[PDB]
């Protein structure tokens, strides 16, 4: 066929019940994730092609960057709780990988402050149980698919995108192939 299991996607031997419809995993430490988000804009091009009614979820992971990696999973929970993902994603990526100015939880916090989130609001969220449960959700989702690498995307807890079966000579064509594949998998 045009889309083949084992080529543009693989099927989870052990499907995950109750999984988000489209679930993307990343780390702010992950060089290919920087490309996906800052250069390719994968998340955004997938969104523009998703059928009506299917929502997109994006989670941070712990297994890169040690202690700072975990701080970033908690910061990403804060980002989701306050709904400020679109304001901190670029400076977090650039702070970790471009300027390398993020070395501590306080440096992470500075990013939010600079983005206009009140210190007192950031701190309340950081320490909140609502954020603890969001950290838990992120950890559980990654655990459910036995996640060992990022970037990664999963559709309906059943299918895992496989970008390595794709031509990268043109960055545009790769992104739309990726997006079109998510749409196809979504309609399965």
């Amino acid at each position: 066929a045009q889309y083949e299991d084992g080529k543009q996607y693989t099927t989870l031997e052990k499907p995950v019940a109750g999984a988000p419809q489209v679930l993307e995993f990343f780390s702010f430490f992950c060089p290919h994730c920087y490309q996906f988000e800052e250069v390719l804009h994968i998340s955004d091009n997938v969104k523009k092609k998703l059928p009506e009614g299917v929502k997109m979820t994006k989670y941070h992971v712990n297994f890169m960057g040690g202690d700072l990696g975990k701080d970033l999973t908690q910061a990403w929970a804060v980002a989701m709780a306050l709904g400020v993902e679109d304001k901190v994603t670029v400076p977090l990526f650039e702070g970790v990988q471009k300027t390398q100015t993020i070395r501590s939880a306080s440096d992470i916090r500075d990013v939010f402050i600079n983005a206009g989130i009140k210190g007192e609001e950031y701190d309340a969220a950081w320490n909140s149980f609502v954020v603890k449960s969001l950290v838990a959700q992120q950890e559980k989702a990654a655990a459910d698919v036995q996640l060992r690498g990022v970037p990664a995307m999963f559709v309906n807890g059943k299918y895992q995108l496989n970008p390595q079966g794709m031509d990268t000579s043109n960055m545009d064509v790769f992104v739309q192939q990726y997006a079109d594949t998510v749409k196809y998998l979504s309609e399965k």
Side-chain angles (χ1 to χ4, degrees):
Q2 294 287 343
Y3 298 102
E4 279 165 5
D5 191 294
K7 176 50 150 166
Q8 298 94 331
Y9 69 96
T10 52
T11 302
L12 296 186
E13 60 184 344
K14 293 223 284 185
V16 178
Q21 293 166 287
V22 179
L23 177 60
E24 185 183 347
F25 292 101
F26 77 113
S27 172
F28 284 112
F29 279 97
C30 160
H32 287 128
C33 306
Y34 188 108
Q35 295 299 317
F36 263 43
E37 177 58 21
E38 301 303 307
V39 180
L40 300 177
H41 311 282
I42 291 295
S43 293
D44 194 74
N45 281 270
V46 170
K47 171 184 173 83
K48 301 186 329 220
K49 271 181 174 173
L50 289 175
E52 196 178 45
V54 353
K55 64 178 292 177
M56 202 147 166
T57 305
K58 170 144 61 181
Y59 289 161
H60 197 269
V61 304
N62 291 340
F63 57 80
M64 303 185 73
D67 213 279
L68 245 193
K70 284 210 76 160
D71 274 331
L72 285 163
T73 301
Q74 185 161 355
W76 186 249
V78 173
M80 292 187 286
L82 299 178
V84 291
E85 298 96 323
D86 293 343
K87 300 164 165 196
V88 300
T89 294
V90 167
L92 286 173
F93 263 122
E94 295 193 342
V96 173
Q97 293 188 51
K98 183 177 172 180
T99 61
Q100 295 186 353
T101 50
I102 292 170
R103 296 148 209 128
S104 68
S106 176
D107 299 334
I108 294 172
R109 176 177 186 278
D110 287 343
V111 171
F112 285 71
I113 302 299
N114 191 48
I117 289 85
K118 282 172 13 216
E120 155 156 276
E121 186 190 4
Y122 182 87
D123 295 339
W126 177 270
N127 292 302
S128 71
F129 286 95
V130 161
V131 164
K132 299 188 193 307
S133 49
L134 282 173
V135 169
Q137 285 172 236
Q138 296 179 90
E139 292 183 17
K140 191 196 179 272
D144 286 346
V145 295
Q146 201 159 42
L147 193 65
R148 54 220 299 269
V150 284
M153 192 173 296
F154 296 87
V155 177
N156 292 315
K158 210 26 163 66
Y159 305 110
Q160 185 182 343
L161 273 294
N162 188 44
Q164 63 180 298
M166 300 184 191
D167 177 353
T168 57
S169 63
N170 186 294
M171 322 194 77
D172 303 324
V173 172
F174 167 70
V175 174
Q176 287 324 311
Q177 180 172 11
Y178 195 105
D180 288 344
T181 305
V182 182
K183 179 169 187 296
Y184 159 81
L185 292 170
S186 207
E187 291 159 0
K188 235 171 163 74

